[PDB]
Amino acid sequence: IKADHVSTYAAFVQTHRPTGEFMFEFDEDEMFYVDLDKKETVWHLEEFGQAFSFEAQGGLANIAILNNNLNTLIQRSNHTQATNDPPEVTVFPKEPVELGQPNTLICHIDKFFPPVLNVTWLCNGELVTEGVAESLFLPRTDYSFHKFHYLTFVPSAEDFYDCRVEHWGLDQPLLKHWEAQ
């Protein structure tokens, strides 16, 4: 759209799992969002928050506004629902992998709709607890969505990881496999 840089408040509201979110984006990377339970602005990078604040209420407000709007449009559309677009999923390291050397596995989930997911990591079969983090349901240009699931690990010699992912656009819970050479 002939621009140098792009800053957008994107926020959605839906009737399922994520009751809806509200955030800010600067060139496709997410800056801060508003945690709706905790009623606070959460800054993606530590230095962001220590640089400037943002009124948590403003996002709360807009979320309420959009809750409303949802219902209006539930009307003038005889309750129409789009069909579920399956996720394209890749998994890759954050740093170059090497022998017993602290690293992070990234699980990028793309091109899906709606944003309702169950995502878990499996390490040699086992479900991982510690080491797991994750992005918000990020909104896309094309009104599809994508997410990042993060896992920290040490590159063991023989040792595999699968990124287990459930979404309505599937029925096979899809796992992308991953390992070193």
């Binding site: 621009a3 840089h5 994107a10 839906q14 959009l66 209006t72 789009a82 170059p96 709606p114 009104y143």
Partner: protein, 198 residues
Amino acid sequence: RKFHYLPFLPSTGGSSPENYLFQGRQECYAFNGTQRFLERYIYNREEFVRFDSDVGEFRAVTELGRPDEEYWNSQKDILEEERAVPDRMCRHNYELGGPMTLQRRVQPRVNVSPSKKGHNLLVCHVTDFYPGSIQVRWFLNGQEETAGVVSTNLIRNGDWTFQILVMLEMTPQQGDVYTCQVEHTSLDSPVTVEWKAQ
């Protein structure tokens, strides 16, 4: 000293199991000190209405958003406040965000590895940089290398760092000095690292 925002507009007519989504985007686009604003409203993937500063008013992207257009455009106070945004909200945030956003600089880490037997490759693994604008170049004994090179697409880690892999085609001779070279808005002097085979 704080990020400004914009209340959304109420829709018209307010007065796997089921699922409905409603999205709203408020996008600022900056060019040469210029600023153009775009407020769109999506129901379930279908963008139905929208405001473009460059148009000056709303357009019904699908018949689904016809009721909003008619109402909103016969509302002088609404219009006048949309038009203001390029200068109110957009300017404020763009200017406020600057140092941490526009002036963000992250030194990439560079790394060179084999990967061979059983073709023959040499990955130059460049991790952890912002912004994503980067140049990566190969040299054999000083001299550039076009043929045999594959750049992965730029890959967003989504924690405000990018990653990239540029592998080269291999034919190791004897005293070969193979240099990977990177350039980025952060480091002024172009960082390089190399490889031999003995």
